[PDB]
Design a binder for this molecule. Structure first.
Ligand SMILES: [Zn+2]
Lengths: 69, 52, 83, 286, 83, 83, 83, 83, 83, 83, 83, 83, 83, 52
């Protein structure tokens, strides 16, 4: 029901914990990741990442682009 | 007779086609031809400036 | 009557048969993309399902005319009155 | 007259040959021309292809006999744009020193374009003008020369002669037959390469003889279908009706606006495949 | 008389049957890409829907001509008048 | 009667056979995308399996009408009575 | 007479029906790739729309020649005149 | 009886032949996606193999009805009893 | 003689119809790849457009050998002379 | 006697020919993805190969009934005794 | 003669029509990969072109053997000489 | 007698033509993936060739059966004796 | 004899038209993947071309048997000598 | 006579126009392109030499 998401940058950590769903703006279109998603490497657009924590809490960090692994 | 009507029908169709051709299809070609003539002339002027 | 009535059974089979063939392949293509979109972003499913039903109307529109004409030639018959 | 007779008259050529008694005379019926054998000439096709070839070279000579090497005049500006377009087309495909490939491509493109362009003028104008100037009412006269399979076959059989020529001239007689029998299925050992010579020959011979046929029939099929639709649209006016002679004018306009794109594209395809087929006859592509 | 009328019923079935077969396959190819684009870019779905209806008119142009000609053959056979 | 009856046997073969052909290709396209989506998101499989059965109902809709009419023409016959 | 007239009605369904099938699959293939580019690059839409109408002219070229020779066969008949 | 019996052999060949054609292409599409998923994630194979058999039942359903009707038309005959 | 004239109308319909079908599907494949390449990099559009027209001459070659022969079978007739 | 034996020769060519057409395309699809997986994961080829044979058995299942019935009609015709 | 000559016009329409269909789909598949290759490697365009014209000789060989035997059947006839 | 012999030439054409059509497309699909895999891992080519030949045996299996039953129908025809 | 010779002309079109259709699409698929591989690895082009011609032999093998048998049925006739 | 000797009639005209173009139309026009490329090149070279 949850996975260990870690939002990090070359300078410091942005978020670290347990999440239920991760919504990202990929280079080829939006993604919705949930527990047990298959291995995936992707280029991220500059925009807000929405995360859902168990339960109902919705983190909305703004990121200037990057890589989702 | 029917043969005379074929020449009239062909003639009006050819006139409206020639109108569309000379008023809208051909003018861009005149512009493309004259712009090359300008670009050639300006290059030769720059070569004359360098000689002076 | 025999030639007109026998070739009308072939006509009814082509109308529903070519319609069934195209509709089944068309929904395999449309529906395969609905599942692909639903897997990319699970929260978009409510919108994608409504957008799929709009396309389903365009997809089956001509097949429904074909089924209607095939059931018209089965119970009534315009060709039998033409002789 | 009837629509079948109107269409059947537009599809016959001005033939000249061996009548029952003498090698000097014009055929007066389609059947009087079918009786005549293999040694033949179409006086309307050879009268338009040669005249347009001379008019093209005369206008291009007027822009070459006084070439400035400085600031260009209106006529030579156009001729330089055509020469540079063809030179660029040849340099992006052929890397050798051959002096024939570029003037051949310019001649092929501008000449075929003119042979096709005369299709835009109304289909009954030239046939009736020829009949009025001659004093006859049953004179066969076809103006568009690329609607004759013989004109298009003559243009591709000459390009095929240049392909077999340059292939022997640079690869040698041994290299010509070598490409035709030792490629594409080249085996590493001798016991199998000899069981692949019948195969290599069928595939390379069908491919070599199909270049002349495909070049002639692509041009013939696109032009004969283009003029035939203009003849069918002219039959809409023969009805005498108003709501048919209005739809016919709109279809004639839409067809002429579409056909000028095809007339331009067919001249381009013939030039580019003539450049490609002559460039692949100068190097071993395998 | 029977062979002209009987072969007309099969001509009718071929026109609406081949049109039904092609439009259903074509709208699943077109609509499958509409759902893929909508799942990837949900803010663009109002634009993609209008661009899709412009391709829908091109995809159904020759098929609606066939449907009109098929109904004409059924309720006004133009061949029975040709002996 | 022998030509009407023998042409209803081909009508039935066309009507069930073209339906079988379309339904087999259609489910190969739908099912191949279901396996791709199920491998990408294992936690969404319960939802994707239910959504596949929605599409399966649209995919076979005209094929079931074709099988129903083909069984009707096999055990009963509207053409034998000349309509 | 009846064989030429009935076998020209089947020639019109093959001319207009086979062109309808091709034009519908061809525009689903070309418009699917247009809607894919308009989602990937929403700024190039105006340019891609023009380049799509150019290719549309090449797709619907031999189909309009066949839809026009098939209207020539229903309102006139080059075969009947040959007895 | 001769033409009804002769046309029943062709009816059986179309039922089994169109069914064999569709099922081979359908499993070629469904099968290729099972191997693609299995190569990317070899741990998922136990789940994907069970999900493939759920689709395989839907894919062959109408094809097996067609083979059942074809064997019935071969070892018995519902048309011959209608004269 | 009516068999030779009626079977020439079918030959013309098959010869133009199979060309209308192939050219519409063949250029819808090529046209989509041209739009996809244009979306990837719009700087190369002039060059890609020139290459597309060179393939348009290879793709429509044999379909025009059949449209010319078909329009030579409707007005002239090489089979009537052969009796 | 002659129409039943002539039509059963065509029934045998349809049963084997449609099965041969579908199985050759089906193995091209299935086998193409087997090589893609083997090139992506060289160490998994013995695992992917056993899974390919499980699908191969499903892909050819109906095709083997088709050739079985075709060889039965060729040497022990079941329709020649029904007239 | 009337059937041997009228069934040679159908023979000719299938030799040039099936070849016209396969070459327009084959050059639409081959060309779609040439336009993408021309985008992925703008400097490789002159190499990709010479290699595509080598494939083009293999792609049209059997089609061109058929446009020859069809023209041989339209202006000579190996079947009419056999009564 | 003439019908059986004439309809056995059509059976041979279908057994070899349908087989040739499927085999050509099947090797186009299989071989295309063999080139894709060989370009990605040029050191695994020896292994990919043997794996492609394993699949080639499956792909041509029913085609080889049909081409053996077509050279049997041609020389020492099995249906001639039956009548 | 006129029916055996007329049906033989049609068998030949199927034996060559189907082969033309199959090889043209097969080489479009094979060659399209050769240009894709040539664009990514221009160093591998001479190796890939040798592997492409190995596959080309498997793709046209059955098609050649078909054109060999087709020419045999035109210049000789195993059916005419069996009547 | 009636159809095929036109295959050589058109072939002869083609080869004659190709040889005429190769000697009296193409060389005089291509030379003007060669000269202008040198006229511009000489101006760029003269400017660099004069500055140095
Ligand atoms: Zn070589």
């Amino acid at each position: 029901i949850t996975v260990h998401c870690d939002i990090v940058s070359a300078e410091a950590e942005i978020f670290s914990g347990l999440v239920e769903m991760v919504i990202a703006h990929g280079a080829l279109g939006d993604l919705g990741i949930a527990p047990g998603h298959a291995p995936l490497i992707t280029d991220l657009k500059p925009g807000p990442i929405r995360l859902v924590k168990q339960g109902g809490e919705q983190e909305v960090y703004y990121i200037s682009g990057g890589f989702l692994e | 007779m029917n043969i005379n009507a074929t020449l009239i029908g062909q003639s009006v169709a050819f006139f409206i086609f020639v109108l569309f051709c000379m008023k809208f299809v051909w003018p861009p070609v005149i512009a493309a031809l004259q712009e090359r003539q300008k670009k050639i002339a300006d290059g030769l002027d720059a070569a004359n400036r360098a000689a002076r | 009557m025999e030639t007109v009535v026998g070739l009308t059974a072939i006509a009814v089979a082509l109308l529903i048969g070519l319609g069934a063939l195209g509709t089944a392949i068309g929904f395999g293509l449309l529906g395969g993309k609905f599942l692909e979109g639903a897997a990319r972003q699970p929260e978009m499913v409510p919108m994608l399902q409504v957008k799929m039903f709009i396309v389903a109307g365009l997809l089956d529109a001509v097949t429904m005319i074909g089924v209607g004409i095939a059931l018209f030639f089965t119970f009534a018959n315009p060709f039998v009155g033409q002789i | 007259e009837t629509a079948s007779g109107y269409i059947q008259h537009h599809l016959q050529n001005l033939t000249f040959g061996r009548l029952p008694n003498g090698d000097w005379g014009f055929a007066h019926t389609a059947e009087q021309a079918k009786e005549m054998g293999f040694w033949a000439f179409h006086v309307d096709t050879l009268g338009w292809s040669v005249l347009l070839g001379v008019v093209f070279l005369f206008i291009f000579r007027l822009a070459a006999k006084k070439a400035t090497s400085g600031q260009p005049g209106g006529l030579q500006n156009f001729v330089e744009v055509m020469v540079e377009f063809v030179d660029t087309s040849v340099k992006d495909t052929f890397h050798g020193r051959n002096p024939l490939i570029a003037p051949l491509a310019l001649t092929v493109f501008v000449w075929i374009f003119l042979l096709n362009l005369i299709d835009l003028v109304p289909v009954d104008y030239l046939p009736m003008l020829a009949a009025k100037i001659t004093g006859d009412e049953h004179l066969f006269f076809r103006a568009v020369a690329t609607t004759d399979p013989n004109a298009t076959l003559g243009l591709s059989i000459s390009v095929f002669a240049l392909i077999v020529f340059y292939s022997i001239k640079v690869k040698g007689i041994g290299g010509f037959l070598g490409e035709l029998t030792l490629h594409p299925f080249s085996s590493k050992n001798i016991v199998v390469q000899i069981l692949l010579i019948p195969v290599n020959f069928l595939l390379e011979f069908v491919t070599l003889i199909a270049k002349p046929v495909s070049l002639a029939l692509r041009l013939f099929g696109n032009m004969y279908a283009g003029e035939l639709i203009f003849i069918l649209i002219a039959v809409m006016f023969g009805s005498g009706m108003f709501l048919l002679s209005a739809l016919g004018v709109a279809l004639n306009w839409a067809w002429a606006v579409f056909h000028i794109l095809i007339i331009t594209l067919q001249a381009f395809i013939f030039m580019m495949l003539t450049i490609v087929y002559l460039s692949m006859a100068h190097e071993d592509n395998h």
